[PDB]
Amino acid sequence: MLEQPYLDLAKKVLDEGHFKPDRTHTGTYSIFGHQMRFDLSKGFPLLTTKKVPFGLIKSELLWFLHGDTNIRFLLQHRNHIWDEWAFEKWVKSDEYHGPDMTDFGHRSQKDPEFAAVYHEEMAKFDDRVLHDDAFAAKYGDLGLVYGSQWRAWHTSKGDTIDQLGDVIEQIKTHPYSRRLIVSAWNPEDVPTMALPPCHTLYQFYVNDGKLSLQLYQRSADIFLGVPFCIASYALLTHLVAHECGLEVGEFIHTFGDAHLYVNHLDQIKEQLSRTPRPAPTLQLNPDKHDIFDFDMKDIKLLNYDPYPAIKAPVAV
Amino acid sequence: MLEQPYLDLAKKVLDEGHFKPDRTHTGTYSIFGHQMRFDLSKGFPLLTTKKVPFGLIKSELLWFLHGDTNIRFLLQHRNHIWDEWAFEKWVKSDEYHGPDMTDFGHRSQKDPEFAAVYHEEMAKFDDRVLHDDAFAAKYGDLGLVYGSQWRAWHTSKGDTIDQLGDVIEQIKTHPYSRRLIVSAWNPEDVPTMALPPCHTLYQFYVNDGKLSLQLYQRSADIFLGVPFCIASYALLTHLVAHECGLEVGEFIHTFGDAHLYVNHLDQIKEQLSRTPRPAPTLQLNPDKHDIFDFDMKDIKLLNYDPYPAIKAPVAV
Numbered sequence: 001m002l003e004q005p006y007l008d009l010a011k012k013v014l015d016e017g018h019f020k021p022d023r024t025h026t027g028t029y030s031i032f033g034h035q036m037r038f039d040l041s042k043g044f045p046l047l048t049t050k051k052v053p054f055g056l057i058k059s060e061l062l063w064f065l066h067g068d069t070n071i072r073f074l075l076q077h078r079n080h081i082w083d084e085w086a087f088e089k090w091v092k093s094d095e096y097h098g099p100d101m102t103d104f105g106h107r108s109q110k111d112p113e114f115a116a117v118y119h120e121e122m123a124k125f126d127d128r129v130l131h132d133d134a135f136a137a138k139y140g141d142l143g144l145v146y147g148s149q150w151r152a153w154h155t156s157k158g159d160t161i162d163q164l165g166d167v168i169e170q171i172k173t174h175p176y177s178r179r180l181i182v183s184a185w186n187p188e189d190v191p192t193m194a195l196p197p198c199h200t201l202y203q204f205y206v207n208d209g210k211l212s213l214q215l216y217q218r219s220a221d222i223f224l225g226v227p228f229c230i231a232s233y234a235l236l237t238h239l240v241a242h243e244c245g246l247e248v249g250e251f252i253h254t255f256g257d258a259h260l261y262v263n264h265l266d267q268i269k270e271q272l273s274r275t276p277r278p279a280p281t282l283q284l285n286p287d288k289h290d291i292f293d294f295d296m297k298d299i300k301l302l303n304y305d306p307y308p309a310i311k312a313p314v315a316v
Numbered sequence: 317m318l319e320q321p322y323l324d325l326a327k328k329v330l331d332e333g334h335f336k337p338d339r340t341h342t343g344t345y346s347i348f349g350h351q352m353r354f355d356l357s358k359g360f361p362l363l364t365t366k367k368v369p370f371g372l373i374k375s376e377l378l379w380f381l382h383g384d385t386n387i388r389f390l391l392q393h394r395n396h397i398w399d400e401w402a403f404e405k406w407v408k409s410d411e412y413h414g415p416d417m418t419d420f421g422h423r424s425q426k427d428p429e430f431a432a433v434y435h436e437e438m439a440k441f442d443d444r445v446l447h448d449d450a451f452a453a454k455y456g457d458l459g460l461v462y463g464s465q466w467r468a469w470h471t472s473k474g475d476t477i478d479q480l481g482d483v484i485e486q487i488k489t490h491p492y493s494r495r496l497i498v499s500a501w502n503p504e505d506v507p508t509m510a511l512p513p514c515h516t517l518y519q520f521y522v523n524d525g526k527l528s529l530q531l532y533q534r535s536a537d538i539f540l541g542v543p544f545c546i547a548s549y550a551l552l553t554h555l556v557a558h559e560c561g562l563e564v565g566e567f568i569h570t571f572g573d574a575h576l577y578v579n580h581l582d583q584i585k586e587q588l589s590r591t592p593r594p595a596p597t598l599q600l601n602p603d604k605h606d607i608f609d610f611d612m613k614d615i616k617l618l619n620y621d622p623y624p625a626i627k628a629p630v631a632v
């Protein structure tokens with residue numbers, strides 16, 4: 001089965017993972033250096049042993065591909081994955097006149113009524129973003145996110161480089177190149193970032209008319225993150241390929257610090273009692289070729305028969 | 317035996333490696349995505365199945381650790397690994413009055429007498445570098461090399477960041493961090509570089525009082541390059557550890573495009589007929605702790621009993 005590597009990584013961490021604490025003060029089980037391989041010609045690696053929302057995955061990837069960094073687009077697509085980051089900037093800034101949200105993410109799990117106040121406060125902020133173009137302009141723009149890291153790298157001369165755009169052009173002109181790399185790591189920015197990119201660097205490769213892609217993830221949440229990441233990068237390996245007119249080869253996920261939060265142990269064991277079903281299948285619109293102009297309707301997932309969704313808490 | 321992974325990578329490429337040409341127009345056998353693991357507590361990974369020059373490895377690493385980018389230091393240490401790059405800039409510039417060296421690297425293998433002319437021309441340039449401080453200042457400074465990428469990253473504000481310096485400080489204050497990353501990839505520079513860094517990115521990790529390091533190599537010459545690289549990065553994992561007062565764990569070498577030049581096939585097979593001996597041992601000076609102030613005499617390699625050196629041609 002196509003998703004075996006993910007189960008193995010999960011089992012493995014459970015078995016060889018050494019205890020290791022972190023920022024959130026919640027302990028974890030970590031390993032260092034791992035590498036999975038998913039033959040993308042066998043099917044699309046969307047977990048069948050637990051329901052993963054492909055809709056959110058598409059929304060987020062297209063956002064990146066547009067070089068966009070404002071929440072407004074994602075919001076219009078019912079995507080709220082990046083809300084806390086915008087919200088957090090709104091609460092620590094001027095004008096915010098409302099219940100003190102200091103430590104909203106952490107407290108939400110503990111104070112019940114607080115969760116109520118915060119959830120509506122959030123609901124309001126999002127509405128303002130979504131409608132007040134002025135507000136969106138200053139609170140919905142996350143700044144340094146994958147969208148601007150891949151397609152608008154700031155140069156020392158006050159200019160901008162479209163890493164993804166250029167790399168794609170190169171795949172077309174020099175497929176056998178070894179410099180097909182897109183970095184999301186800027187030494188100038190990381191020192192003062194809310195969250196340096198976990199999806200640190202990827203590189204393309206072409207051989208036998210097939211496109212492959214390797215992603216280097218400095219840090220991974222095996223339960224919550226990895227499941228999205230695989231699908232997210234597997235989608236791109238499909239997009240770029242389609243555009244360049246190659247076939248799809250395999251996705252290679254290399255890990256730095258792969259961990260499993262102690263509060264996710266039961267749930268992950270719960271998933272390990274499942275037997276993966278046949279993998280779903282991606283269907284891309286044949287009329288469109290400019291991935292930069294792709295839309296939600298141009299990507300279709302067929303035969304997605306998963307197990308119910310396994311619920312687990314976000315440990316900040 | 318400690319170096320088994322390297323043999324396996326070699327055998328593997330020979331067995332699953334698909335043909336793939338490149339810039340030098342010499343064909344290669346490539347694979348995409350590999351990952352070796354060397355437990356550094358078992359010994360120092362310097363190849364015993366073929367003599368590797370640890371002297372050059374030390375010279376080069378210290379050069380990097382000093383944030384230096386000029387050939388003069390390396391020259392004083394009889395190191396000529398980076399000569400062609402300096403020489404190449406001298407020949408394509410003004411003032412060069414002598415035999416046209418256009419395509420010296422490639423031609424050297426073909427025109428015998430040419431090799432003679434070029435070799436002495438080189439000998440002269442190096443002497444000028446080594447003695448004329450003015451000359452060295454403009455022809456010996458390679459510019460963007462690991463030394464300035466690790467310890468003098470140019471920011472958009474015309475400043476400079478000491479990635480290595482800072483990361484080291486972090487290991488001391490926050491060992492369990494997942495942001496211990498040093499990048500040698502600058503999207504602003506790669507577009508116009510003679511050779512973008514093959515040793516693209518490394519990340520540190522600390523657990524159980526042991527320091528580990530993973531290196532991401534976008535491109536590798538399995539015969540000539542990989543042997544140096546392992547030892548080079550294994551030395552650093554030892555240096556930083558010593559400084560931070562941790563123990564050494566393991567070195568993890570992840571590969572993007574790992575290849576074997578077609579003109580190295582015989583020689584690599586030749587090496588595969590060998591049986592690795594016990595690994596050598598690194599001995600660091602206990603009195604010094606500032607790796608930035610380390611010198612050739614502060615690093616000692618014990619029990620290095622290798623097989624003779626296997627000769628193979630440099631395919632540009």
Ligand SMILES: C#CCN(Cc1ccc2[nH]c(N)nc(=O)c2c1)c1ccc(C(=O)N[C@@H](CCC(=O)O)C(=O)O)cc1
Binds near residue numbers: 195228315
């Ligand atoms: C993906 C991604 C990158 N990111 C950014 C990001 C930031 C910090 C992180 N912290 C940790 N430990 N793991 C992560 O996956 C993680 C991811 C995400 C951020 C939020 C959600 C999210 O809210 N959805 C969760 C929980 C939903 C809920 O509360 O019910 C989910 O399970 O999908 C998902 C991903």
Ligand SMILES: C#CCN(Cc1ccc2[nH]c(N)nc(=O)c2c1)c1ccc(C(=O)N[C@@H](CCC(=O)O)C(=O)O)cc1
Binds near residue numbers: 396397537544630631
């Ligand atoms: C190391 C490194 C990075 N580098 C930079 C660099 C640049 C282009 C490359 N090209 C290829 N195919 N492989 C490499 O290892 C390589 C390395 C090196 C550059 C030169 C030598 C060198 O001259 N020594 C060779 C050959 C010596 C000889 O001519 O006799 C050797 O075998 O050591 C070694 C390493």
Ligand SMILES: O=c1ccn([C@H]2C[C@H](O)[C@@H](COP(=O)(O)O)O2)c(=O)[nH]1
Binds near residue numbers: 221222
């Ligand atoms: O695909 C993803 C994206 C983000 N994160 C996680 C990584 C860390 O658990 C946390 C960020 O903490 P640091 O690694 O930066 O310390 O967010 C993932 O696990 N997977």
Ligand SMILES: O=c1ccn([C@H]2C[C@H](O)[C@@H](COP(=O)(O)O)O2)c(=O)[nH]1
Binds near residue numbers: 178512514515545
């Ligand atoms: O440790 C090292 C350093 C450099 N090179 C090689 C990689 C490529 O063979 C060549 C550079 O060519 P590109 O990958 O940039 O095309 O130099 C290595 O193999 N190993």
